[PDB]
Ligand binder design. Sequence first.
Ligand SMILES: Nc1ccn([C@@H]2O[C@H](COP(=O)(O)OP(=O)(O)OP(=O)(O)O)[C@@H](O)[C@H]2O)c(=O)n1
Length: 288
Amino acid sequence: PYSSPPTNLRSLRDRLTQVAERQGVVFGRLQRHVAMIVVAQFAATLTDDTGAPLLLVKGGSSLELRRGIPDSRTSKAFDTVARRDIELIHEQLADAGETGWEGFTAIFTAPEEIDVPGMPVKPRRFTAKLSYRGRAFATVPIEVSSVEAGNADQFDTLTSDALGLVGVPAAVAVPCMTIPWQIAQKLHAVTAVLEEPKVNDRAHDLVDLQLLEGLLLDADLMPTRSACIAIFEARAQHPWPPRVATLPHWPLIYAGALEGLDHLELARTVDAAAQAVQRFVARIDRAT
Ligand SMILES: Nc1ccn([C@@H]2O[C@H](COP(=O)(O)OP(=O)(O)OP(=O)(O)O)[C@@H](O)[C@H]2O)c(=O)n1
């Protein structure tokens, strides 16, 4: 246990290395995780007139927070749903990063519209360039999506002790989109059928959906069913409940997304994973 915060970036990295070995995770994953937590602390300063967050973490970053680095895929971005339009979010995020948090500071690049087949609204992507006490520490890709069907009306508050473990004591509170909404979105995405030149490549959703099933309590099954219906209705595309199919190019992609997750009970083949998520769909659909 450290008595005080790292005096500089060198000490922070040395401490991260120390915690990574003790925890048995890869240093670069832990460093990404810590940088994402730091970004979340800037994001958490964005609030409406009632103190409620303007930004909720979702996607792979949400799963990492809920399950831990060992039990989740590498998250590619700090992915969020936003209750305000991107220009306000960016302006307040940039101000938060300039003011800093526990010695960390951030510069945010200009947002850019992203293409993502199947979503009603194109998300915006940009980058946070984080420093620790004036030394470049890491860059965190950030993704921001519009609300959908009331998916930001509720949230959970996640915590990590990763920064405490390197001696940064402030409280971590990460507002996160709820598991029922997160299931609804991923179920829609993995079952969407794209225009025939384009093809659906989201075999990794079959991993995330198995991971989410492991988190869901039965008391939230009927909430999840309603959230699935709301998402499928709002998106005005294929109907609920969907058929969880696979495509011929998915096997290698599904195997890649499993990398490092063997200690879990995940379906070993992609077609087995599709049938397991199909069973999940049926369980959700019967919780009336
Ligand atoms: N048709 C789609 C595509 C994606 N998403 C949402 O956008 C997020 C980002 O998708 P992606 O870019 O593929 O990242 P992740 O799925 O979170 O994980 P990874 O990039 O590591 O594969 C997902 O979590 C999901 O909530 C969605 O709702 N519908």
